[PDB]
């Protein structure tokens, strides 16, 4: 048991589709309408009636015309008091909390909404200036989505922890795709792409510096006066600053968003690699200066990973991130599916030749490689001679040949179709909202003070406030 | 010829939907209605009801209503007597028969059918004690789901002979599906996790025991009273041991079933390779105490078996468990075909160049190999040199290679994308019907005398009985 | 030029459909209709009829309908003659052109027909002996189906030239569908099967005596009186055997049906298989009386075509049939789309790798095996060691690899995926066609002069003529 | 700011659909419609009714009505002047610009249209001539196709950048396909089939003349008198002389059409693989008169180029060039994003396990090909014994087989899947398209002064001009 209803009937009727008790409450002098109180679990029944939806059809125009209605009747029953920014016991406002939970019809309306009465259009959110036959040109004020300084609408949607239904659908309505859009053609593009060409010349300096290592051992290596050596140095300082810088930029991203740690391995994919590079390359240098030899073991981990890594850049290159974004999926998704299939498969035949075969192929790891082998098409079949029960073992081998090679890959490669037609659409909406976290980076870190990343204007643009001021609200022209 | 028209014209109205000959026959002073008397061949009129059912809307409607009116005249002519609790010649109830056949339409009615008239509303399945607008709280008087003690719904369905064409959809009805999810969540999930982790340790121990088998010939071995003869004996003991137990629970299953002999292969998979398990390991130890050396031939193949029988376990994990389950499917029913198409080719082309080349290579075995070598990607393509009609081999060899290696294996592989893209969707039942049975299993086994898994209990929660008795009947509450 | 207005107006108003011409035609005093009468080019107005067909919905209902009205008052004006009767300029029935055309709307109707009046029910061919709920048990007095001593239906389908836009479709209606299972269910199954172990015997004694050959040269090879000389013999002369009774089988099969020498390659595949196999048995008899060394070198292009053709037995067996079909399928009409595109990359890079290094591997044929290699996975990258120009060398075999190995390949598998998506239900009809065909051989030869294959019986079923006579038509019935 | 309203609101009627205000404009005595004048721009009012076009069905019905209206009212305001032929700034007509632009609807209509009034029947386009009843004959006098003296419509189709989203959808229209059609049966397939066969002729003559080179170095090679080296100068000469007619065309193509340079590698991939094929040629032309034994190196490239560019001629068996064009399309648009991500993973682990393994597969070249290896299934797993961190080593080598063999290469066939399954349909009008391009370059050179290639000819099948005189306009004829 439990619900909104005590103290607040309100919120069940706007539930309910009973709009006849919200105008009854208004102003009867039994008890008026108190929409403006907040309940006791801190929010609002503006919040409530984000609550009930779910996006279908008639759920959409339900909880679509029961806002829009109670909205006007607090304006008109209290001009004084704003509704929309009263915040939650957690701090989210109607647009904060549909935007959190997903609900993309209600985001829909909050971003568009229109009013065509006077006294009361400071409500609306669409302005038109031009208006065409092919083409008009309309305007938004929308605040609270750049920088909201509490938790702007972008803030909310980004860093969400892919529980939220519609987490990368939302982003494609126009007040804010083409927000990111511009913001990405205007400045962001070409901070990503020289980060890119940074990260780039980090790597070959990194490749250079780590294949000239000096082949004696026990390190650390004096230095001589020659070139070669103030050259491997300097690449070697430059490698272990690109190390700790991701380390702590690893960190920040962690201490700031502070995932669920079951988010934290199917999202925050790029930082946990990126960090896993840096956390090699510190127990790298700790190595190498501990007088062991072993270093070198940690560096190419890194040196691996530091290529492979490139991949996240693809971001960036539409056409180039949409294949980027299968390795993440199938990694994450079908690897361990195949996996535990694969080495019951392999373990259970090597196994069985090994304990077959006894008097070179007597241990269980050159069996268990020697079977692997058959995946890579250089399997022998004859890697044994002068051995009992031969027959037997040549059974054993073809059950597991015909068993792993011959079906077990084909069956992978199968699945690995059917779920690439399942994510066709995906993945893109999976790019932008990897697009979208990128810009929302680039915008917070900004590098140099700079933040000159505004909307088209913070001119007069409605002039129909309650009051007799001006507004003032940062407007974007789109030409629709 | 012939019908069942003979002394039952409501089997006919009811293939006709003719309601009117009900009522005329309900209480004519002629005749009235003996719905309460058994047919010839032991069954009722509501098992015809049932039989006449083909799952289509239009039929669902018409047996229903046909069904729920007859019920109720039942109640009101005989109201001293039930009719669901009378059995047939083999013993079901129109629910145990609606489920046998496969009728879903008339079960997703008999356990979700509602009452609003006094003095006969013991006949309602579902019940409503909270009414909120987003949810509701039912509660169902399911019984003869769980024990019946003489055919259990679910019995009946789970051991189905797999020619039921709703063999797996019947269990996603809701007063099924949510007393399997409840039933896994409460107490038998730990059971097969339990279960589980037994079977691991026990293939870990006969890995272990046989790797170290003693390499000299002619068992038994005498033991020493050094360590590793006590540690070698005990995990012999405790792997045989296994392996009687499988035997024993195999012949278990077998007995109590007993399948059809040919539903044996389609149905019963898990258990017919467990059973093999067990045969070789018994196999294994007679020969062992036979004084033969080859045991170990019969050893390995249980090894082999037992860790792939690992699978079986895969069922309890649905992401893993639908995997597994498409393994099952192409080794059962598309090998078959595969292997005649290819084996023909590989002996007609074998053959061929083995009686070609003759003066090493010319046994018909060791050119079966080596053409079988052309599929792991290991040909050669010049296998013999200095041998006459060199033109004629290598355009046979290439034939063959052409044949083989370059279509039919892609035949293959395009014909598993068909299939696994035909049973993405299939394969989900299948693993809840999978988890079903093993449900069942473990309810009837129960390990050590306990019992206590009852629904939400007894309670008089209807109490609207014709007489003034009190309904006892293991409620269950649905959160709707 | 050329049009139906000259000399027959009743055809164009069948192809305007307006009856209203008919009837007035009919029997006017001024001139009655002629139905009965042939056209000049030997057809009548029924095979109009069907020549306006064209098996869509509208064109369905008006030409059946039209059709009808035209036999009803075609009987009514002359009761004294039939008109379905009347054959063409060729010999074909309305019943035999809609076949032949592939018209599967008229030819469901004409096998269909139906009518509820006396002195004219003569003319259809549905009738109903018992009528219960559920299922009815009709009959057909259909003729000129098993044996028309014309023209055959079945035979004017099996055999039709590939032309026919229905080939296969027409023959799953049922008064055919059911036909076609009966004769298989009776006594075709046995015959066949019993045709398929003989030829299995056939195979293995060919194999065994060919395997056997005497390994000195020069034959014929001078005979012992031991057994195993007697054994070879025997087993050669039963090969022979062979090999000229299906060479008197595929040349009957060509006299008798005659195709057209475009369809001889995409229909009667089978028979051109079986026919090349006897070609090369009987070129190898030739050789091998010739006393030439060589007359193996044919030998085994028999055996090898023998064992593969053992495929034509997999009609038969729908579930393997099927793919049998789809490897035919491709062999036909794929492989020389990919082996153009296939051999044009490998001989361009074989003959600029040859040109390249010249001073083993330094003729035309060596580099092309060289570079085949690449494709069954064994190419090694280095099969040239100290020659001129390297970096030019493996640019090329790089570039070959990566188009062919990698992307050649692999479009390949991804286009047979499609296409066999593209016939995942064209081959079921394949396979009925196919046993349809041999039905009909099976039928047409019967082995010892035993034709009591006729359908349920001649009895005066219906006996209403416009005649007082009686009905003969060797009726069928079928438990609808 | 900015819009069309100035000085003519006819356009903005026509984007409107509002017809009040044209009529109304048409002929007021205060100021008449001035259609016939051109805007500030050069276009008319006509051209801006095809530019507000979009192809969907409600503006295809709007776009045509009304430019049939205003074609009605130009006709009977102004009959001294036709407007359909009055050209833009740059001189597309109607119909061109509709064609340019890629405006199906109305490109459709505007070469179809119709008039069933006197006076004004001279400016259709279909004409009918006999009239059956399921076929008809009709007819088009459409000029401005063949040779419009300025831009054919075939031209502008043909010759479209790539961007027009109707690109190759405009030639389904029947006055094009059927035209395109007969062109093709009537003389240019004999044209094509030559130049096939003649370019057959060279390729073998150079492949030929390359590999008889005269294996001493420093060339030029004195000739003998004997046959051999007249041959082999022979075809040198028919070689060089191929590449320089192949240098001409290929610049002559470039001049004439001038593509965008971004396009030039989106279209025109045929010609600029023969040119670069004639530049290889070329270079190695000039190396051999150069005294310098490289020039074979460049030769080779030419001849692996030449025998590749053979896939041209594929075009022209559509069987077969909808497999050609498929290639064209994977080696563009998928070969790029899959080798930077094949490359980035080869790259890193080749630098890794370098780096690791340092005292013979030393150098980052010799490892890049090893692990390049396990891709065409040679690799070995241990092409080094000895060396340090071993365990290390292994889980490299293993990590990269498990990455790109068996993930990324079967992620890579699969995507080749879907994207040829989502360009079934498109490779068909691509096709068609390269079938237009090539019948439109026939006609262009016609090799011999001939040009009797007109349509039906000049019939007089209107004759209904405003004046007295007669059409003369080469009709082509259609039997629908
Ligand atoms: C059906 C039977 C009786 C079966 C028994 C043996 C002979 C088997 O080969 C087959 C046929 C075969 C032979 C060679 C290659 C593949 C399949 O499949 C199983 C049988 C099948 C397998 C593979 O089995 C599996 O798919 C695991 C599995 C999947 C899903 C399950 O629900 C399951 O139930 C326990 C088991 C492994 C073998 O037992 C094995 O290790 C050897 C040596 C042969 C395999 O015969
Ligand atoms: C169509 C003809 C005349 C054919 C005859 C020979 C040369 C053939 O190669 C082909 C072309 C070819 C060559 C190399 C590889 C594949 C195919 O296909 C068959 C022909 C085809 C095959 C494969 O045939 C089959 O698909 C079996 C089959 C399937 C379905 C059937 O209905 C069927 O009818 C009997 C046979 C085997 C060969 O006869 C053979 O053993 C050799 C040495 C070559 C094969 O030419």
């Known amino acids: 048991p439990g619900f909104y209803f005590g103290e607040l009937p309100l919120s069940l009727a706007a539930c309910t589709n009973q709009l006849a008790i919200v105008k009854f409450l208004l102003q009867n002098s039994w008890q008026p309408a108190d929409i403006s109180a907040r309940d006791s679990v801190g929010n609002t029944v503006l919040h409530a009636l984000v609550e009930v939806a779910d996006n279908t059809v008639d759920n959409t125009k339900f909880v679509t015309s029961m806002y829009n209605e109670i909205l006007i009747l607090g304006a008109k029953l209290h001009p004084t008091l704003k509704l929309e920014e009263i915040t939650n016991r957690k701090g989210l406002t109607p647009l904060a909390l549909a935007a959190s939970s997903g609900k993309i019809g209600v985001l829909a309306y909050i971003l568009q909404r229109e009013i065509h009465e006077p006294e009361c259009r400071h409500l609306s959110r669409k302005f038109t200036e031009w208006a065409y036959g092919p083409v008009h040109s309309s305007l938004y ?278 779920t690439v037609n399942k994510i066709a659409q995906e993945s893109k909406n999976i790019w932008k909202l990897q697009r979208a976290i990128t810009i929302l980076d680039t915008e917070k870190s900004f590098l140099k003070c700079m933040r000159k990343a505004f909307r088209s204007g913070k001119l007069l643009q409605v002039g129909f406030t309650p009051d007799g001021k001006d507004d003032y609200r940062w407007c974007f022209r789109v030409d629709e």
Request: hydrophobic fraction near 50%.
């Open 141 to 418: 004020d929308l605040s609270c989505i750049d920088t909201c300084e509490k938790n702007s609408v972008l803030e909310v949607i980004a860093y969400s922890s892919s529980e939220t239904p519609n987490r990368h659908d939302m982003l494609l309505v126009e007040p804010l795709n083409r927000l990111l859009q511009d913001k990405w053609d205007r400045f962001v593009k070409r901070i990503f792409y020289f980060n890119f060409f940074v990260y780039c010349l980090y790597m070959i300096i990194f490749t250079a510096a780590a294949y000239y290592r000096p082949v004696e051992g026990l390190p650390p290596y004096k230095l001589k006066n020659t070139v070669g050596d103030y050259f491997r140095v300097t690449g070697e300082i430059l490698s272990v600053s690109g190390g700790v810088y991701f380390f702590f930029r690893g960190i920040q991203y962690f201490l700031q968003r502070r995932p669920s740690l079951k988010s934290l391995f199917v999202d925050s994919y790029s930082e946990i690699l990126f960090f896993v590079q840096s956390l090699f390359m510190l127990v790298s240098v700790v190595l190498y200066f501990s007088q062991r030899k072993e270093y070198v073991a940690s560096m190419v981990f890194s040196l691996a990973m530091g290529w492979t890594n490139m991949l996240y850049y693809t971001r960036g290159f539409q056409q180039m991130g949409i294949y980027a974004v299968m390795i993440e999926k199938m990694i994450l998704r079908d690897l361990c599916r195949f996996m535990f299939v694969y080495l019951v498969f392999l373990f259970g035949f090597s196994t069985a030749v090994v304990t077959l075969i006894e008097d070179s192929y007597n241990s269980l790891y050159s069996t268990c490689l020697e079977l692997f082998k058959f995946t890579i098409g250089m399997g022998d079949l004859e890697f044994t001679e002068n051995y009992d029960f031969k027959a037997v073992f040549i059974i054993l081998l073809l059950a597991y040949v015909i068993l792993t090679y011959i079906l077990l890959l084909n069956m992978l490669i199968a699945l690995m179709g059917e």
